Amino acid sequence: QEKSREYDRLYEDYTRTSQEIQMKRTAIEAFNETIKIFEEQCQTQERYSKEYIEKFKREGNETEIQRIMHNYEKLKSRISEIVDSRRRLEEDLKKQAAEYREIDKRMNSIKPDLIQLRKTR
Amino acid sequence: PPRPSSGELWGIHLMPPRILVECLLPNGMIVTLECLREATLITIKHELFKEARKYPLHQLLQDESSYIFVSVTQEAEREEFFDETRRLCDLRLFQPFLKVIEPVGNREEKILNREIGFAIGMPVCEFDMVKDPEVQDFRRNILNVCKEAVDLRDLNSPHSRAMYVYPPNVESSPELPKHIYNKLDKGQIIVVIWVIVSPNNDKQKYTLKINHDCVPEQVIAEAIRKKTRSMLLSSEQLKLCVLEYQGKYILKVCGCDEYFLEKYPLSQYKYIRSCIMLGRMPNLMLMAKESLYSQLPMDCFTMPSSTKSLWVINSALRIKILCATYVNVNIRDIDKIYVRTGIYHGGEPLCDNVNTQRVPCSNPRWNEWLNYDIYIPDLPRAARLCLSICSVKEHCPLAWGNINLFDYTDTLVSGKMALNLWPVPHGLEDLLNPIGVTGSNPNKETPCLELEFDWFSSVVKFPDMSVIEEHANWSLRENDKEQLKAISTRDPLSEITEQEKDFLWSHRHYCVTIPEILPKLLLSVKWNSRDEVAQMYCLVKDWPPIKPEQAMELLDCNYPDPMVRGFAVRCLEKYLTDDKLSQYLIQLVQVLKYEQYLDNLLVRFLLKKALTNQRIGHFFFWHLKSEMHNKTVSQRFGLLLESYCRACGMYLKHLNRQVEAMEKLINLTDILKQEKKDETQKVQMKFLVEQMRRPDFMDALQGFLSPLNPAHQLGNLRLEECRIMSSAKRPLWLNWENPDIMSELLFQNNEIIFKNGDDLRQDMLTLQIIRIMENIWQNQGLDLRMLPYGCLSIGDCVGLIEVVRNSHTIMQIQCKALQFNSHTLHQWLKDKNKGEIYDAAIDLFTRSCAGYCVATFILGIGDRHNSNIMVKDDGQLFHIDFGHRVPFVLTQDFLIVISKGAQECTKTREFERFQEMCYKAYLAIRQHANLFINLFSMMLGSGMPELQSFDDIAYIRKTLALDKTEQEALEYFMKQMNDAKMDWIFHTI
Ligand SMILES: COC(=O)Nc1ccc2c(c1)OCCc1cc(-c3nncn3-c3ccccc3Cl)sc1-2
């Protein structure tokens, strides 16, 4: 009975952590898919800007070139923001998965004890 | 994967009024745009392409029309937004960004897959991603059911399509019980037929007094006679009117989407039968067949996208346990671990359980062959290996898993196999879990155990029926007949001794003459013996069909064999009415969980019926959709929902509207339960009002079909009547107008309580049981009136409750300054029903109260207060809140009413009559006990904690006195019944 009050409380943390972990896993999945899209955007920038950079270089129009650069820099900086936001989540997931293991280790110590008592009682 | 929330952004329930959206242009440019959260993609695109003119490479961009927006959803998938009518807040965006792309493939296909994926609650591309051949084979082969169903909808093209959309909601049998016939005078009904006459769309009525057995066409014929009587037409021309126009018209219930499209008698129609009962005038609306047929669209269905024999194997079963990659054990407490195994047929073992050697948890390697005392030939089709990694502290399982020893292509499983294990359930005391999910955990981030099966000469396949029949065809007294008749009558929970088991098997050939004993005979077979099973297979092949209610039991956990299940399905295919299939759909959905493989005769049957009748289709959708959170059923139900959504026609668009509405509701209630949690009702209401007023909500929640009953169109929201209920969990009382032209003649209001937080499956099941009990009583000719109100679970502890118009709890009426005596309820009824109406009201009270007194006793519904028992103005009593040694209950408050106001309420002919209703009702339910037992037993597989074992079902065995005689049961019940305000707030003394 004493151990049943805590095993039941422990399972309540096992279940939440499991839910929360599955959420983080799909958020990381969404971050990868977001990162892939932004990378795909850079390939699109190089493809189109190639013939504009080329014309302006053959024209000494250093501003219009630096203008195409400032926007590419913005796009590039944003990919760093997303990659660093994904890493922050990755390490949070790692910390939580470490917790749902220690919740488990705790449970698999109480569970064989509780089983012996229910039989005795 | 499916979305965690109903939020507008990941981790954000509600996006601000104005938000910054990163726009990724097709020229490789990034533009930050500030948008209103309620802004449509049309507006955002226009706003963007205007702004884009300011940035480099603007000259490359073609017209806004030439592009589409793409983003990543909270479901972690790349969505293409074709419908640019959708608002920023309603795209389930992961991060606030949008990409501009040139649309790629074919619109039609991508659009449908978007619409399917949304309704299911997971993208279709995820099914395409599954490499499992059984999944892909299910996807291709189920289309045969879709194509067959779509073909019957188009055979007799106009009527057949209307028949699918508006199936006659008619009673079981055309035969009326005499107590109901006596209500309609001279065996005739006064009906009112309305017409919306043009110009100015004015209403015109025609009252008709005709027989109840009248086909709707005869009802139209008599109406066209009433109209033509003044025309001076000759007898021959008058007859020709009826002859040519008798069926150029259709009948509809006023203020409802209920149509009288089939040849059934008028009284058989559920609307009409309730009117006959209630003494109400049936209001019908006449219409042109073409007026209805112009509404019907769809039916645009498009298609997507060496052997050796088992028991030629002279060997005992061998299974090699190899390695188990990790286990989370406290090495200080648990040193050794072992793999416990067992070969099972359902929940019963085929042989004694075999363990591996105890190993140190630091090295979970066994590389051991396990020897089972069973020959390979004796393995039944449905045999399974049930295993678990157990600890030695004193034993306990750590992780569990089950596998079918044969695959869907009848191939005996051979070779190496990795099995991702499932966590042990809370309260699973047993070392193994055979009535668990047979399959490897879709979560690969779990303990996985490698396995190895014997590899015989070539490919091992389960024998053909020709082979089985040939092996079977190779391998009566007076008291004996009485003994078989005794076993037959016994409820499915009554234990049959090994002596009785031997007796049934030894008399198996006679058993065919008493066919309703098939479930008792099937439990007497040694499933671990091919000698017995082959003989049983032959008996089943030529077994006479049994009632659907009997055949349903053959689909629960006790009957895993495919031949048994096949027979069961064939009985339902031959005898189950659409009325009754709708009545047992909850159980029929759960019982799919017990099927070994994805593609089976039960799924194929249920799917065809759902794609054949939209009433069935609607609830088949919602029942499956509600369980899309439970990963133990996510794939099977997901694949099933995909096949339904692909072939249901235009209904998928209505289903998407209902899903959209529910998603907003779940999100608004989550906000009230979480962020706003600690706010006063006053404050929370101001927020609710602000929120519901917003365009997106007004769009989402107005003008859709009630998920509780699609025949009810939910029009414009009556915001003044909408509120957050004072109770905990924050339920939403929502009120909608009735958009029907004749909304005045049925119901002008549509009230629903939306409740997020509580599991509504208990309530849902009890309300179904109540409906069945009423149908048993009403069929037997016992007017006992029940109110099985609408209740639907739409997901994980989210659901809807139908608000019963003109009802009050006994508590509410007691508070009508605030002085109540046990006479208060009677005084209330006396006042609400003055005159000759009084007698009728008191009668309705006694008939309804009697039904509820018996139902609640039988089921064991306790915690009954004056705040969970309600009474309609007409006098009808009914109970509410069914989330759960319960005796008979009859308050002096009720007694006073029953006894029309008398001081000695036990010594009246009223109470005598009442007691007679209770006895008759109780004995009627006891006679149909197997049905109730079977319905609850089909519910063990579902996650319902109140129904986890047969021991939980054993309560009805007690209240119905099933081991007792019928006179001993009557005596018991009569005893329970005869056994039977100041501080009503807390109850002290
Ligand atoms: C007309 O005046 C009224 O007060 N009507 C009314 C109120 C509540 C219900 C009802 C007519 O219809 C019957 C169905 C029903 C069912 C309810 C229920 N079921 N489970 C929990 N509840 C519940 C109880 C109290 C408050 C809210 C809820 Cl959802 S409440 C309810």
Side-chain angles (χ1 to χ4, degrees), chain B residues 775-988:
Chain B
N775 258 298
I776 295 160
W777 296 328
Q778 223 71 46
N779 193 93
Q780 248 221 267
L782 288 140
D783 205 351
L784 287 129
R785 287 199 186 87
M786 308 295 276
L787 222 156
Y789 59 87
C791 174
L792 180 78
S793 173
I794 63 114
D796 193 12
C797 307
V798 262
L800 294 173
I801 305 170
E802 159 181 320
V803 168
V804 59
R805 249 145 293 287
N806 312 103
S807 325
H808 306 275
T809 64
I810 310 297
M811 198 65 251
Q812 275 168 322
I813 51 228
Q814 274 177 355
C815 302
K816 282 173 159 196
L818 217 159
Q819 303 279 289
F820 44 96
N821 301 268
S822 283
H823 304 258
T824 307
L825 172 65
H826 183 268
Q827 209 56 71
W828 181 76
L829 274 186
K830 226 170 186 184
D831 192 74
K832 291 227 174 167
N833 300 268
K834 291 162 185 154
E836 293 187 36
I837 296 133
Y838 175 92
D839 305 288
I842 301 279
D843 179 66
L844 182 53
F845 188 87
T846 79
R847 296 193 162 282
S848 62
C849 174
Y852 274 101
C853 274
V854 165
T856 60
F857 173 75
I858 291 161
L859 296 164
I861 301 146
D863 201 49
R864 312 281 68 196
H865 355 271
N866 287 325
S867 53
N868 68 213
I869 292 157
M870 304 189 87
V871 164
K872 270 200 135 183
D873 293 1
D874 64 15
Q876 202 180 331
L877 186 132
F878 71 99
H879 287 232
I880 68 156
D881 187 49
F882 299 113
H884 319 95
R885 307 186 162 183
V886 193
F888 199 86
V889 286
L890 183 68
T891 330
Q892 278 101 91
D893 297 0
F894 303 145
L895 273 164
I896 278 153
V897 182
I898 296 151
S899 290
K900 279 173 176 190
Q903 223 48 68
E904 302 212 31
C905 292
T906 307
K907 210 196 173 184
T908 69
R909 296 279 161 187
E910 279 81 42
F911 179 68
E912 280 183 38
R913 270 188 79 258
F914 174 83
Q915 278 202 322
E916 208 62 77
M917 287 170 185
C918 296
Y919 302 153
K920 286 165 154 69
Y922 171 86
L923 280 188
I925 300 312
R926 193 190 182 270
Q927 283 152 216
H928 295 80
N930 317 75
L931 174 66
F932 298 96
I933 291 152
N934 291 340
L935 294 169
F936 282 105
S937 302
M938 280 193 282
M939 242 50 207
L940 300 178
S942 64
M944 259 171 281
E946 322 73 15
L947 293 163
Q948 289 179 84
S949 67
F950 292 88
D951 300 331
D952 314 342
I953 303 152
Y955 188 100
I956 24 163
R957 248 224 120 166
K958 302 167 173 186
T959 39
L960 294 171
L962 293 193
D963 298 272
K964 287 193 178 175
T965 328
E966 238 206 5
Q967 238 287 333
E968 291 199 333
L970 227 192
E971 183 90 74
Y972 162 68
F973 189 59
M974 285 173 72
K975 195 161 271 180
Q976 283 278 351
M977 206 168 322
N978 289 5
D979 291 356
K981 286 275 284 166
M982 176 59 239
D983 186 21
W984 52 277
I985 317 91
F986 304 103
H987 312 283
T988 324

Side-chain angles (χ1 to χ4, degrees), chain B residues 174-449:
Chain B
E175 293 294 83
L176 217 88
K178 281 229 169 158
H179 79 274
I180 288 158
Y181 185 98
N182 293 308
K183 289 205 179 249
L184 68 147
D185 76 88
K186 310 283 177 184
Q188 292 197 299
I189 181 77
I190 297 163
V191 155
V192 174
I193 284 175
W194 301 87
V195 186
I196 288 150
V197 198
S198 289
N200 298 92
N201 332 123
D202 296 358
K203 293 168 217 191
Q204 272 201 10
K205 62 171 152 195
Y206 305 97
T207 322
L208 303 166
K209 183 157 182 175
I210 213 63
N211 307 347
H212 72 274
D213 40 289
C214 279
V215 169
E217 193 158 88
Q218 285 164 33
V219 180
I220 296 151
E222 204 70 72
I224 92 162
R225 268 186 269 273
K226 257 215 161 186
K227 184 77 204 177
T228 322
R229 219 123 269 154
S230 29
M231 299 209 193
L232 289 155
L233 246 76
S234 65
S235 356
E236 53 239 307
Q237 298 176 288
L238 285 157
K239 282 174 194 171
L240 226 153
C241 289
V242 179
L243 164 66
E244 211 178 289
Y245 300 92
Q246 209 172 19
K248 279 309 292 161
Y249 301 97
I250 267 161
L251 287 175
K252 182 189 147 293
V253 168
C254 291
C256 239
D257 273 18
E258 291 283 0
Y259 298 82
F260 294 67
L261 304 188
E262 195 57 285
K263 280 194 149 178
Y264 300 100
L266 216 66
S267 81
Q268 202 171 7
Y269 278 91
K270 292 182 183 169
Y271 168 78
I272 305 302
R273 200 161 288 179
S274 82
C275 285
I276 292 164
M277 260 152 67
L278 288 156
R280 279 269 163 225
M281 185 107 67
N283 293 290
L284 305 177
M285 155 145 74
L286 204 131
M287 209 173 296
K289 224 104 160 169
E290 274 167 56
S291 292
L292 209 174
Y293 296 164
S294 178
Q295 290 175 228
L296 317 165
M298 35 169 272
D299 259 31
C300 50
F301 172 76
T302 322
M303 288 285 191
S305 293
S306 55
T307 54
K308 198 182 180 193
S309 173
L310 191 276
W311 79 48
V312 157
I313 312 302
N314 193 85
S315 176
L317 184 68
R318 253 216 314 174
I319 296 155
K320 195 184 193 187
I321 302 289
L322 293 159
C323 188
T325 80
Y326 104 91
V327 209
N328 309 317
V329 160
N330 205 98
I331 293 102
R332 291 195 166 190
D333 290 65
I334 297 91
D335 24 44
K336 281 173 161 194
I337 55 133
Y338 65 104
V339 175
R340 164 146 216 118
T341 74
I343 271 66
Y344 283 82
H345 188 76
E348 281 273 338
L350 274 352
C351 53
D352 331 330
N353 292 170
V354 176
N355 293 359
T356 62
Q357 266 152 51
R358 287 166 169 185
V359 122
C361 65
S362 300
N363 190 257
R365 238 145 299 182
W366 293 275
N367 285 68
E368 179 188 345
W369 275 102
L370 297 182
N371 320 284
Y372 305 94
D373 58 317
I374 187 136
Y375 276 146
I376 295 297
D378 293 315
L379 284 172
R381 185 82 181 76
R384 302 146 65 231
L385 162 71
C386 303
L387 57 86
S388 78
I389 284 162
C390 302
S391 64
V392 209
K393 173 97 193 266
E394 232 167 301
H395 306 271
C396 182
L398 309 155
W400 65 271
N402 326 129
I403 298 135
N404 302 315
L405 302 168
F406 288 86
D407 71 28
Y408 71 106
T409 46
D410 313 293
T411 298
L412 174 66
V413 178
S414 164
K416 235 174 246 184
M417 176 184 280
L419 173 88
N420 293 267
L421 299 184
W422 295 89
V424 313
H426 183 261
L428 185 108
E429 52 183 315
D430 308 328
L431 288 187
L432 293 174
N433 185 25
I435 306 172
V437 208
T438 132
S440 100
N441 200 332
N443 179 358
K444 34 163 209 285
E445 293 276 84
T446 57
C448 170
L449 166 97

Side-chain angles (χ1 to χ4, degrees), chain B residues 631-666:
Chain B
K631 301 204 217 234
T632 87
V633 281
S634 250
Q635 200 184 64
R636 157 179 271 135
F637 283 15
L639 291 161
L640 188 44
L641 286 167
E642 171 196 54
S643 47
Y644 169 79
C645 292
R646 218 162 264 297
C648 66
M650 291 298 153
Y651 204 57
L652 176 59
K653 280 153 177 177
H654 296 274
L655 281 174
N656 270 357
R657 276 199 60 66
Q658 290 167 38
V659 171
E660 281 163 2
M662 303 326 284
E663 287 306 312
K664 288 235 153 292
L665 291 186
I666 289 156

Side-chain angles (χ1 to χ4, degrees), chain B residues 149-193:
Chain B
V150 165
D151 286 1
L152 314 156
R153 261 147 58 173
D154 217 276
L155 198 150
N156 199 322
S157 218
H159 183 262
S160 232
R161 271 168 55 210
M163 213 54 179
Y164 168 55
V165 187
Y166 311 105
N169 170 266
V170 93
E171 301 267 349
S172 15
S173 191
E175 293 294 83
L176 217 88
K178 281 229 169 158
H179 79 274
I180 288 158
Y181 185 98
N182 293 308
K183 289 205 179 249
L184 68 147
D185 76 88
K186 310 283 177 184
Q188 292 197 299
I189 181 77
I190 297 163
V191 155
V192 174
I193 284 175

Side-chain angles (χ1 to χ4, degrees), chain A residues 21-75:
Chain A
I21 282 157
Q22 248 85 280
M23 309 195 308
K24 289 182 183 65
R25 294 214 181 107
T26 83
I28 282 133
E29 215 126 74
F31 268 121
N32 302 319
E33 202 42 55
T34 291
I35 286 153
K36 285 281 167 150
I37 276 156
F38 272 72
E39 298 183 289
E40 276 167 288
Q41 184 74 0
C42 318
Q43 269 97 270
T44 285
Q45 136 103 30
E46 18 253 45
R47 270 162 211 148
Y48 291 115
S49 81
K50 213 172 158 178
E51 273 192 75
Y52 278 83
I53 275 159
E54 242 176 335
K55 157 239 206 151
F56 300 133
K57 272 179 177 156
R58 203 208 315 112
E59 227 156 59
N61 200 343
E62 296 150 65
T63 62
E64 291 297 346
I65 299 166
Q66 281 155 54
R67 213 165 79 87
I68 290 161
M69 287 325 295
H70 180 52
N71 193 277
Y72 185 68
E73 283 170 40
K74 226 166 264 189
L75 173 66

